[PDB]
């Protein structure tokens, strides 16, 4: 490849669902995604959105094109559907885990295809909505996706954690355990 | 339960900055790249049969061909020298280096950007390479990386870190 890789357009659209995503990537990281509903450029790092700009109209236009093309390619292929994959999750901390020192648990899920997934956290087996953030789907060279979920937490001798991934490629949600 | 996915991407490959650029666009239907522009060829090509209706058609229309070609400058070159040089290429985040004991010393190097880094163990002033095990680069997904470097041994042991965000190396003694 290269010293660097700019991906200056990623348009992903799916049917049914009418699910669109438009991102920019640089060296594997997400610069921004275009909030298609709000027509807004949403930067992964706030500072960046004040150092540079992107007109979200670009994203909307891109998705519109790909939406149309998907129609055409669906017919052109005799409506061949996507083949579901089984994703793979690994859990790890952002930092070395020190009791009573706040940290972030990361769930990385790879081999995501199609890009529809539930990634949610269990804290000793109850759903943990609070302090949870997720990334966009990042592109893989084999045209599957990866996605990360983050849980902020206070480490503790007394707490067990799971990353649970629900995907069509899996019959029932699957738990990835960390302690 | 039939599901369909389409992907379009414009990929810019840069070597020694913009001294060498390769521009590739890709049209993908359900993981099948079926048409591609590649600046190394200078025109669209069917990658598979699904792309046979498009590539030559697009090649016959001079404005399609001139516009796609020029994206090497108007997208790749423009982005790299403009926004990207003030954002991604200027970002420097210094690693945090902590040593702990697993038996083994573990040197955790966290929260740095960019990826280019050298972590070295030292026992009493000498660079050890034997019995040293580094992870791969771990991508946190948030414009930071981490690397954990194990020393199978424990003397004064020093974890030594080199990174573009640093005027001189971090040395952490144990």
């Amino acid at each position: 490849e290269a010293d660097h890789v700019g991906t200056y357009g990623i348009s992903v659209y799916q049917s049914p669902g009418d699910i669109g995503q438009y991102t920019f990537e640089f060296d594997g990281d997400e610069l921004f995604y275009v909030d298609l509903d709000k027509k807004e450029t949403v930067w992964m790092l706030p500072e960046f959105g004040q150092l540079a700009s992107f007109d979200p109209q670009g994203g909307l236009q891109n998705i519109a094109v790909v939406k149309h093309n998907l129609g055409c390619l669906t017919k052109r292929s005799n409506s061949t559907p996507a083949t579901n994959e089984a994703p793979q999750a690994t859990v790890f901390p952002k930092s070395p885990v020190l009791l009573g020192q706040p940290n972030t648990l990361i769930c990385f899920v790879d081999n995501i295809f199609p890009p529809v997934i539930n990634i949610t956290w269990l804290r000793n087996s109850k759903s943990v909505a609070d302090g949870v953030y997720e990334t966009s789907f990042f592109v893989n060279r084999d045209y599957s996706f990866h996605k990360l979920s983050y849980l902020t937490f206070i480490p503790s001798d007394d707490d067990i954690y799971d990353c649970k991934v629900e995907h069509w490629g899996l019959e029932e949600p699957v738990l990835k355990h960390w302690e | 339960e039939r599901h369909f996915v389409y992907q379009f991407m414009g990929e810019c490959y840069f070597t020694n900055g913009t001294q060498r650029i390769r521009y590739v666009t890709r049209y993908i239907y359900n993981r099948e790249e079926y048409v591609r522009y590649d600046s190394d060829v200078g025109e669209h090509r069917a990658v598979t049969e699904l792309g046979r209706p498009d590539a030559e058609y697009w090649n016959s229309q001079p404005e399609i061909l001139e516009r796609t070609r020029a994206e090497l400058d108007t997208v790749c070159r423009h982005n790299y020298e403009g926004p990207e040089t003030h954002t991604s290429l200027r970002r420097l985040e210094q690693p945090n280096v902590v040593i702990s004991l697993s038996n083994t010393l573990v040197c955790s190097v966290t929260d740095f950007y960019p990826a280019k880094i050298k972590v070295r163990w030292f026992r009493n002033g000498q660079e050890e390479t034997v019995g040293v095990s580094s992870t791969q680069l771990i991508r946190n997904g948030d414009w930071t990386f981490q690397v954990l470097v194990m020393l199978e041994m424990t003397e004064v042991y020093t974890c030594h870190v080199e990174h573009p965000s640093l005027k001189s190396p971090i040395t952490v003694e144990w």
Binding site: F24, A52, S53, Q61, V65, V66, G71, C72 | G10, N79
Partner: peptide, 13 residues
């Protein structure tokens, strides 16, 4: 500075 993007060709079917 402004990020600019590739534009996909639209297919007629």
């Amino acid at each position: 500075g402004l990020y600019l993007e590739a534009v996909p060709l639209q297919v007629g079917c």
